[PDB]
């Protein structure tokens, strides 16, 4: 243990806004590539304040967007980000 997923914690400061790559998406959340092996899911609400049907409206496959790293769940190999807070801070 204490490898890649951990490595993020020891390498990236939480709360910073970082450009990632939206590789995959689904109607409830989108997956951004921040570091190899960890993908950040962004809830449909974190995308926009209005009715978003599918993340594709805002972020499609291959989208490179700076998002705020709000949390890191390295024990579940997950990472949390929100475009709302990215614009907020």
How is this structure best described in words?
The chain has 89 residues and is of the alpha+beta class. It has one domain: Nucleic acid-binding proteins (OB fold (Dihydrolipoamide Acetyltransferase, E2P), Beta Barrel), CATH 2.40.50. It has helices spanning 4-11, 44-47, 83-88; strands spanning 17-26, 29-35, 38-43, 63-73, 78-82. Strands 1-2-3-5-4 form a five-stranded mixed beta barrel. Strand 2 (29-35) and strand 3 form a beta hairpin. It starts with a helix and ends with a helix. Binds mRNA; thus facilitating recognition of the initiation point. It is needed to translate mRNA with a short Shine-Dalgarno (SD) purine-rich sequence. Residues 15-84 form the S1 motif domain. It comes from Mycobacterium leprae (strain TN).
List the helices and strands and how they pair.
Elements: H1 4-11, E1 17-26, E2 29-35, E3 38-43, H2 44-47, E4 63-73, E5 78-82, H3 83-88
Parallel strand pairs: 3-5
Antiparallel strand pairs: 1-2, 1-4, 2-3, 4-5
Strand fraction: 35-45%
Regarding quaternary structure, what we see is: monomer
Order of helices and strands: HEEEHEEH
Query: How far apart are the first and last residues' alpha carbons, in Å?
Result: 33 Å
Amount of helix: 10-25%
Order of the strands making up the biggest sheet: 1-2-3-5-4
- Class per helix and strand makeup: alpha+beta
Task: Tell me the number of structural domains.
Answer: 1
| CA-based gyration radius | 12 Å
CATH fold assignment: OB fold (Dihydrolipoamide Acetyltransferase, E2P)
Supply the CATH class: Mainly Beta
CATH architecture designation = Beta Barrel
> For the record, what is the CATH homologous superfamily label?
Nucleic acid-binding proteins
Shape: globular
SS summary, helix count = 3
**Structure summary, number of beta strands:** 5
Largest sheet: 5 strands, mixed, barrel
């Amino acid at each position: 243990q204490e490898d890649p997923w951990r490595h993020f914690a020891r390498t990236h400061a939480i709360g910073q806004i970082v450009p990632g790559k939206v590789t995959k998406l689904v109607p409830f959340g989108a997956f951004v590539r921040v570091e190899e092996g960890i993908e950040g899911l962004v809830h449909i609400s974190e995308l926009a304040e209005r009715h978003v049907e599918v993340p594709d409206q805002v972020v499609a496959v291959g989208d490179d967007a700076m998002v705020k790293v709000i949390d890191i769940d390295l024990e579940r190999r997950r990472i949390s980000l929100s475009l709302k807070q990215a614009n907020e801070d």
